[PDB]
């Protein structure tokens, strides 16, 4: 059953654009081991064929055989279910908590980078740091095997596929527009990212820095 993921086209209208939802799904298909294609979509020049497949224009979406699936949480719940052992690994996390550690980081990041207000900047900065801190604590707090590279153990899971693309954007945009870096004293967070960038599943599905940045340029205002 041919699998095809349709994603955000970058600036030239051809290559892979900035979007943590497309990367997340790219990462899952990769981890699933299935054969699949990725097809970029310029939303300001949509092909005839895409309007037929996906009238609503939602992106990303998944052509599974003849079925169209929209909404990133659904597309992933669908893949995890239908691409399943023995032929394909189960990717879901075993600890419910892996699925929520850090979930708040992105929202605090967005609030922080969109803010033009100099007076609020230290609250927002500090908000982001505490959220990173909670993640750092979940990452160093031993999981129910004890006598670890990623959120839920030593294998990449759905939880990482969701969190990693968002973390990447956070790092890359905060560096560029705010001179902000994740403190080195979050060792748990920094081994996690070192381990993540060492895996091609994550490394190879990252949009280039220059694309991540360009996309947040209108939004990210100086103080």
UniProtKB/Swiss-Prot annotation:
Arranged from A to Z, the UniProt key words for this protein are:
Acetylation, Cell membrane, Chloride, Chloride channel, Cytoplasm, Disulfide bond, Endoplasmic reticulum, Glutathionylation, Ion channel, Ion transport, Membrane, Nucleus, Oxidoreductase, Phosphoprotein, Transmembrane, Transmembrane helix, Transport, Voltage-gated channel
An annotated GO cellular component: membrane
Where would I find the GST C-terminal domain in this sequence? 88-216
For the modification S-glutathionyl cysteine, the affected residues are 19
Its EC number is 1.8.-.-, 1.8.5.1
What reaction does this catalyse? L-dehydroascorbate + 2 glutathione = glutathione disulfide + L-ascorbate; chloride(in) = chloride(out); iodide(out) = iodide(in); thiocyanate(in) = thiocyanate(out)
Q: Which Pfam family, an example, fits this chain? A: GST_C_2
What is written about domains in the entry's comments?
Answer: The active G-site contains a monothiol Cys-X-X-Ser motif which mediates glutathione-dependent redox catalysis.
Q: Describe the family membership recorded for this protein in Swiss-Prot or TrEMBL.
A: Belongs to the chloride channel CLIC family.
What does this protein's UniProt record list under function? In the soluble state, catalyzes glutaredoxin-like thiol disulfide exchange reactions with reduced glutathione as electron donor. Reduces selenite and dehydroascorbate and may act as an antioxidant during oxidative stress response. Can insert into membranes and form voltage-dependent multi-ion conductive channels. Membrane insertion seems to be redox-regulated and may occur only under oxidizing conditions. Involved in regulation of the cell cycle.
Q: What is this protein called?
A: Chloride intracellular channel protein 1
Question: What is the organism field in this record?
Answer: Homo sapiens
